[PDB]
Ligand binder design. Sequence first.
Ligand SMILES: COC(=O)N[C@H](C(=O)NN(CC[C@@]1(Cc2ccccc2)C(=O)N([C@H]2c3ccccc3C[C@H]2O)C[C@H]1O)Cc1ccc(-c2ccncc2)cc1)C(C)(C)C
Lengths: 99, 99
Amino acid sequence: PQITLWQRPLVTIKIGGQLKEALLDTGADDTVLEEMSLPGRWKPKMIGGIGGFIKVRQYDQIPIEICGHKAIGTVLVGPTPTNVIGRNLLTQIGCTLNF
Amino acid sequence: PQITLWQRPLVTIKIGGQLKEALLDTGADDTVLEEMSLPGRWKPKMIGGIGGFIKVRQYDQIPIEICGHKAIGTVLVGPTPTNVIGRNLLTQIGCTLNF
Ligand SMILES: COC(=O)N[C@H](C(=O)NN(CC[C@@]1(Cc2ccccc2)C(=O)N([C@H]2c3ccccc3C[C@H]2O)C[C@H]1O)Cc1ccc(-c2ccncc2)cc1)C(C)(C)C
């Protein structure tokens, strides 16, 4: 589909069998979601944003559906102000910017 | 043009007679640039992202050019770790997400 930007590009995603709302964010290298439980072991990662850095848990090869599109990749979990889908997953669903 | 998301979507913008590199950021409501001088009035604003909030100066009705596309809108100036082009200007150049 084609999504205009007059409003926030918020979409429904499915992870761990649950539906959540997330923002398609081209300004993000990675995907970071609010606190939640994910399987397996995680690795640490420090990610920097507009206001500084935060600590997050990194889970790899996690199945996640975005707007119905299937993806399997790295998901960071931590104290983010909102769920954001970064380029690591936007590329998996074939997303591009056009104008 | 069609911008790939395999890499960060960086573009050249022309503002205040200067040329700067900025990130096309669909997750950003506003446009924020590192410290620079801009003409006209302004008012303080606090914007929050990953890591917390930062204080910026809000300048309205600022002419800007992105990839040859002219537009006008609000530009925030402050200690942002990187230049970001937000939805308020992405809409004016007719930028959309497609997949
Ligand atoms: C390489 O780093 C990244 O890709 N970081 C991502 C990130 O923050 N991206 N933001 C952008 C992330 C988001 C997330 C958000 C969405 C809704 C509500 C609250 C927050 C954000 O915080 N945004 C803020 C923003 C930006 C411009 C103008 C106004 C505002 C207010 C707020 O919306 C836009 C979103 O895209 C742009 C950015 C890029 C590099 C560095 C850096 C930091 C340190 N050194 C150099 C550059 C700092 C910031 C993560 C989500 C993974 C943290």
